Symmetry: D2
Subunit: 352 residues, 4 copies
Amino acid sequence: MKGFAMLSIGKVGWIEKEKPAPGPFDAIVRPLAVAPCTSDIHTVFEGAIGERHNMILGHEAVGEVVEVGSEVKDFKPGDRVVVPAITPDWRTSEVQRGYHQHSGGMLAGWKFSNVKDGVFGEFFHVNDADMNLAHLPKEIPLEAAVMIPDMMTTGFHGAELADIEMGSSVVVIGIGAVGLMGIAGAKLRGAGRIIGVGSRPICVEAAKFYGATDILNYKNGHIVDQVMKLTNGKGVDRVIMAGGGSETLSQAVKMVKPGGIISNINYHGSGDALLIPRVEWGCGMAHKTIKGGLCPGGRLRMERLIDLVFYKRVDPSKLVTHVFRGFDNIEKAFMLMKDKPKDLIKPVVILA
Amino acid sequence: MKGFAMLSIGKVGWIEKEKPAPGPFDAIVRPLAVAPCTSDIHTVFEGAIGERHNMILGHEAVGEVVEVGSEVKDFKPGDRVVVPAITPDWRTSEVQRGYHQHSGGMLAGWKFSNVKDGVFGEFFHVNDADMNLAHLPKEIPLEAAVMIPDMMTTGFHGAELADIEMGSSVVVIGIGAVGLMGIAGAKLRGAGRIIGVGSRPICVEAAKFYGATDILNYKNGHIVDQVMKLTNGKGVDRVIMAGGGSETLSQAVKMVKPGGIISNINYHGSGDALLIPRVEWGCGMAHKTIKGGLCPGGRLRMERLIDLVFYKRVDPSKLVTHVFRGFDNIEKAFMLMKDKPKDLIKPVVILA
Amino acid sequence: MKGFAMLSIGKVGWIEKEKPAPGPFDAIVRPLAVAPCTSDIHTVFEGAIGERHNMILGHEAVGEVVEVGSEVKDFKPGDRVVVPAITPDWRTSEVQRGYHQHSGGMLAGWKFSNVKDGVFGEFFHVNDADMNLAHLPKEIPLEAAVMIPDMMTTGFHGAELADIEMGSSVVVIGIGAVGLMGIAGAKLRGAGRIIGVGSRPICVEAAKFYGATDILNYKNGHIVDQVMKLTNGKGVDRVIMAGGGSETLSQAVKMVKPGGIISNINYHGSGDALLIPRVEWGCGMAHKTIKGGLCPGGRLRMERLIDLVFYKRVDPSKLVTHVFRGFDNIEKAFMLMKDKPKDLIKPVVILA
Amino acid sequence: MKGFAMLSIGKVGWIEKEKPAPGPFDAIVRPLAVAPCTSDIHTVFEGAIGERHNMILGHEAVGEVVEVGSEVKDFKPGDRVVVPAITPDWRTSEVQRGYHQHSGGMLAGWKFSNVKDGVFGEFFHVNDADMNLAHLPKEIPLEAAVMIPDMMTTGFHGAELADIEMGSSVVVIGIGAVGLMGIAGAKLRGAGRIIGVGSRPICVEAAKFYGATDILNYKNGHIVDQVMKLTNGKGVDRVIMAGGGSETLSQAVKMVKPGGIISNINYHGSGDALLIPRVEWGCGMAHKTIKGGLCPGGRLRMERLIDLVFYKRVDPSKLVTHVFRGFDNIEKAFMLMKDKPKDLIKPVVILA
Ligand SMILES: [Cl-]
Ligand SMILES: [Cl-]
Ligand SMILES: [Cl-]
Ligand SMILES: [Cl-]
Ligand SMILES: [Cl-]
Ligand SMILES: [Cl-]
Ligand SMILES: [Zn+2]
Ligand SMILES: [Zn+2]
Ligand SMILES: [Zn+2]
Ligand SMILES: [Zn+2]
């Protein structure tokens, strides 16, 4: 089979690999719709998580079950499923500890396009079908469904980690796909004011649609100053770091109230360190908590988000600004995330 | 001054009381809009809180500050305010413990028409204005605003206590005003499926408006059997108890999943005890946590709920089915809560 | 092989059964030390979990692995291991929800002597050896180690659910083995005053040993009255229910502060319902949270408790008043739990 | 009256000041025993929190009330009291938010020797006596009690913020007085393995006494390698940062497991930023939570810590390596904190 792979740092291309076969608990799946992630740009062009050789890319897919192992009980060939970007080995210590994202080591629940051939191939392999796949309700369009495995789970996790109080104020820094789902998640956790930070007009409109009550641009002056101005010097209860550089951490510390929470869902891809401003962190005593977490995955996570879409709590289709037909256009969609045109949020490639 | 009072258990009527004066930290407030609460029906007629003599009733008001003590800093004569039903003494050990609702004793945070002349007078007294009042944006209509002091803080507290997971299923038993804000709160906490329980058509329509995806009627079979058939024997993740008898707890225990949470905000004003079904509570080992709390009050709570209304996260006006004008209709509005018309959710009396 | 079995309700005896064989992920273990649980007495003589036929009793063992399936990686024949009383199926929705104790159904994590042949046999079966077994350090005596599978995890879970604040006052109702571990767990969570409730002299001394500052005996007045007296009317921050009838629930509600928490770890094998006193539960608004959970099991839990024993944070050997040797003494140990004598806390039978 | 004070950055001396008078809620207290804090060293000589002129230093005292305001109810002249280091204004939004340490602003709950004359004078002023004083039981000697206002509440807060799981592993970096209480606190939260990092023999002995099961010295290699060695490369569940420079944060991140928590209580007094290592923090996605908080104060905190001392949960007397008599020796003790002789942990000056 063919797949679109990372050949080595800085290099991508189509390659040929043998079609994968399932273990007793696994599934072979055919992608029906897929999408490229900013994370893969980081890993390919920034070397953000080490070198790789001929690793098929991509980890956002809706698919058709093509075969299952003899122990798989809940899925069968022909079943349409949503595939989480995160597909943990479930029988590990980290799972017993409550962190499947890290089953087998740091970030190891994220297999596709990390330590496993991704979804940009004619077939891909899913470990532990029964624990890691969710059935796709026919009422959910492919384009929207494909926003669930990564964009929705990541953005909503930003809002979960934030431990938002009802009616409290939230700043979401960065309004790309993850940030927009951060705003939406924040809204679904009962935030009052939601201040989005960004400027691409299509992101700004998306942001308002998902619940931002205010939009700040980096031109009306420093973001921190603007937030202080909007809040009369009082700052905000929560900050979700969804994009930008690592100087965003400092901005977040400077913007939040003492006792607030800063939630990072941003995949930082470069730099040796992230910096915490000493003084505004109360010299370590301001109770400004800093969290940062890989999105949840697995079947339960998908079914929960599926329910959120099915019952129309959120509509992730607005994230999808580009849709292409055809296997080969995986590459086109991939290059789209690299040069990132100004009208782009998320591309989806339809394969059926 | 005049005030509408409980003369004694089973008796209400207008009385003449001396106009209250403020200590250095207090404000005197004149109401602009008020509403009656079901809980005052309990105390007046079921002696639910013991005997009382000439206690002015009511604890749901938006008002205007008339005078403030020499130590009051943030409010002055003229300001329009939302008054929480719960107005605690803030210098107590329960406050250091984090439970203002019980400052000075169980439920002691609730003073108005509990241990203090309530808001159905030409004027009323607010202890600690700076800590207990919040400015009312002019953008918010009185009939919506008056839903904040009690109905909203109560319904929402049901959803908070419930510790809702994003996408999880919630049953709300009882769809009166509080129950309806429970449904809204659940949605605002990110609930997927929300199953409301109750019959009154007008409540039913408000329940759908606030987020209910299902409405269960007692008399289509016992509620637990209905919930099971809806959820294919799986049960629900959370139950909020907002109305009905004490048998409601057993129903909750039976329908909620192990590891689930049952959140009560209902006033149970009759019977010696509530019953937990031993077997369905796993004989004590089912991790079915049971919680029950008085609504938060104070300035912060009000300010937070106000932001939710102000940024249109919730529209409380659909709670109001009856609007009266003039100080005299307070009586009519109160008795309306006693006989409970079919078309009634919540009555409001507009004064100026 | 032979095992000591529940022949049917009210009847116990030795039976012959075939030696179990392991699946790919399982282990066959031989007991090196075992102990009887009060829970089994309820099962056999009160039919508290339904009738059973020839079900081997017991679920507290330290053992020697004698056989492992082909997929077992961390355990091999000859390994000395601590076996948790709870051995869940790990690949289930309840696990993904964070509740292994309920994997596959309410309490389904508890297999041994519930839905599965228990440890009172020449051999027994442990499902999922890698997830469910823990290595026993040679430095821990068998009799101490066999308190870990159940007594310590249950008792400590009582303190965990109690969510104890440092320096706060805790009452533990019932000072049998579980309550004594409740006392120890509470001290290890940083409780200040710990008030144990019981009368048996041997349990009384042990309670003191594990950290009780006060021991209350019903012969000195109503427990609630006594707690109110000890706390000069203020009550206590937390109550752990570890023994007594279901009337302990009412006592616990009446003695805890508003905002407090009541943690049940007691197995109520009798009655139709537990009763919550209405008034003292603030008619549902006192923020008096009621929790109740089956103990955690599996490998992580065992390994954490082992560390606590290993580093001398707790000494569970004081739970052990009777040490027998040999399989026959299993029956003697069991019956000892039945007609519980006055010098008895926990009996242990050492097999090699 | 006489006071020992910071004249300006890098300068200390005795000065004469007006004896303060109480407001209606305040008390005037004379010190019976005081201790100096490393924090005052940072503020004076590193100008860590900015310029100051004639600010009486010190915020750790046990004292006798010599006058109260007309509104003070629970304290009278002659009463012996433990005075918390943190004495917040209780009627503020931050208190409503649950963060009294920052009442009126970041760190503002900390008044003595921050933005108010401290306890190193013949008298000092305590705002809101009834909320901020605790009675000293006669059973507690002055030297132990004076460890409560700061050392104990700070070290214990480190363990509380760390959210320790029972039997889990903890590294405490820095074993001066605060770190030693961090060790004790962690043991009182049910920690299993506890690894202390530090070198001074007297601290090493105290660390063992308080619960450290291992002790690491910077001399024997990089701390992170040492910890990876003690833990078979698995790292630890929690890290408490209680001393050292800011490079400690990077150490803590490298040391802790994914899903772990890092709790800072160290008062950093120099440098622009603190660095988080990008890679070891999973590029922002390792779920390695960073916390950092000023110690709780107020009456309740003191009362709970008094219980821990009274009921012999912790014996803070071992922190006191130097006791001097006489008011003038405040200077002696303070200079000890500057010079840090190898046998010093905490000095105490007895004034009665
Ligand atoms: Cl096509
Ligand atoms: Cl006051
Ligand atoms: Cl096998
Ligand atoms: Cl003993
Ligand atoms: Cl060990
Ligand atoms: Cl005051
Ligand atoms: Zn991605
Ligand atoms: Zn009410
Ligand atoms: Zn048992
Ligand atoms: Zn200090």
